[PDB]
C-alpha cells in the first residue's frame, strides 16, 4: 500500500496544534512575567517557543482550511500564504535551536567575557536578524517551490545546522567530562558521566528523530522520485509533518522546563490561569 499517500486524520493535526499552542504560550507568558528571567538565554528560549507556536498554528490552520473546503482562485493564494508561513516558521525553529546551542557554548567557553559579548543590544539584534532572514527565506522558498534549488538549499541548511548543533554539544560534554575527572580525584572521596550522556542523548536524539525524516523525504524528492522504495518512503509525508509538530510540543520540556525559575513561574501561572 506504499503507492497510496498515507492519510492522517485532521483531528490529529488540530489536537497537536492546540496543545503545543497552549504549552508555548505558557512558556512565553512565564518569561514575559518574570523579571528574573530576562537574560539572553531566556530570550532565545522565547524565540524558540514563538517559532514552535507558529509551526503548530499554521499547520493546524491549513488542516482546518483544507477540511472545511473539502466539506463544501482563492485556494491558490490561501495555499501559497499558509505555506510561506509554515516554511518561514520551520526555518525560524531550526535557527532558534542553533542560537540556544551557540549561546550555551559561549557561556561555557567564554565564561569571563560572556556578558561583554552577549549584551542585550546584541541579543535583540540577533533575534530580529534571524527572524527577518527566516521570513524572507520562507517567502522565496515558497514562491519558487517548483524548482530544484529550493529543496537543495533546505537540505543544506538543515544538515549544516545539525552538524553544528551536534559539534557544539559534544564539545561541551567533553569539557564537562574533563571537569568530572579532575573533581573525582580528591583525598576525601546515575553519576556525572551518566547524567551528561543522557543529556546529550535527549538533546540530540530528539532533534534528529523529530526533524530528519522530513529532510530525508526532501532528499528522495530530489534524488529518486520514481524509485519503488523511495516512493514508499515518501508516502509518509503526513507522518513526517506530525513528527515535526511533535517536536514543537516536546522542545519546551527540554529547554524551558529544566530551569527552576521557569518551573516556579509555570506552576504559579497554572494556578492563577
Amino acid at each position: 500500500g506504499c503507492y497510496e499517500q498515507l492519510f492522517v486524520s485532521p483531528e490529529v493535526f488540530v489536537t497537536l496544534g492546540v496543545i503545543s499552542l497552549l504549552e508555548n504560550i505558557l512558556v512565553i507568558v512565564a518569561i514575559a512575567k518574570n523579571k528574573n528571567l530576562h537574560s539572553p538565554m531566556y530570550f532565545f528560549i522565547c524565540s524558540l517557543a514563538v517559532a514552535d507556536m507558529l509551526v503548530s498554528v499554521s499547520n493546524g490552520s491549513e488542516t482546518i482550511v483544507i477540511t472545511l473546503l473539502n466539506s463544501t482562485s482563492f485556494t491558490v493564494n490561501i495555499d501559497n500564504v499558509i505555506d510561506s508561513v509554515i516554511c518561514s516558521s520551520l526555518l525560524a525553529s531550526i535557527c532558534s535551536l542553533l542560537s540556544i546551542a551557540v549561546d550555551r557554548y559561549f557561556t561555557i567557553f567564554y565564561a569571563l567575557q560572556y556578558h561583554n559579548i552577549m549584551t542585550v543590544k546584541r541579543v535583540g539584534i540577533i533575534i530580529s536578524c534571524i527572524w527577518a532572514a527566516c521570513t524572507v527565506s520562507g517567502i522565496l522558498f515558497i514562491i519558487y517551490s517548483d524548482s530544484s534549488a529550493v529543496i537543495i538549499c533546505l537540505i543544506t541548511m538543515f544538515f549544516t545546522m545539525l552538524a553544528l548543533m551536534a559539534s557544539l554539544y559534544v564539545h561541551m560534554f567533553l569539557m564537562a567530562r574533563l571537569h568530572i575527572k579532575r573533581i573525582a580525584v580528591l583525598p576525601g572521596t546515575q553519576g556525572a558521566n551518566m547524567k551528561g550522556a543522557i543529556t546529550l542523548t535527549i538533546l540530540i536524539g530528539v532533534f534528529v528523530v523529530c526533524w530528519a525524516p522530513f529532510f530525508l523525504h526532501l532528499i528522495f524528492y530530489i534524488s529518486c522520485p520514481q524509485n519503488p522504495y523511495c516512493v514508499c518512503f515518501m508516502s509518509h509525508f503526513n507522518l513526517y509533518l506530525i513528527l515535526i509538530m511533535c517536536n514543537s510540543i516536546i522542545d519546551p520540556l527540554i529547554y524551558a522546563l529544566r530551569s527552576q525559575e521557569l518551573r516556579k513561574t509555570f506552576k504559579e501561572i497554572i494556578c492563577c490561569y
Binding site: 491549513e62 488542516t63 495555499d79 517551490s145 524528492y221 509525508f237
Partner: peptide, 13 residues
C-alpha cells in the same frame, strides 16, 4: 483543479 495539501513537496513531480 488545484488541490490544497499539507505544506509542500508531499508528492513528487
Amino acid at each position: 483543479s488545484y488541490s490544497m495539501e499539507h505544506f509542500r513537496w508531499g508528492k513528487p513531480v
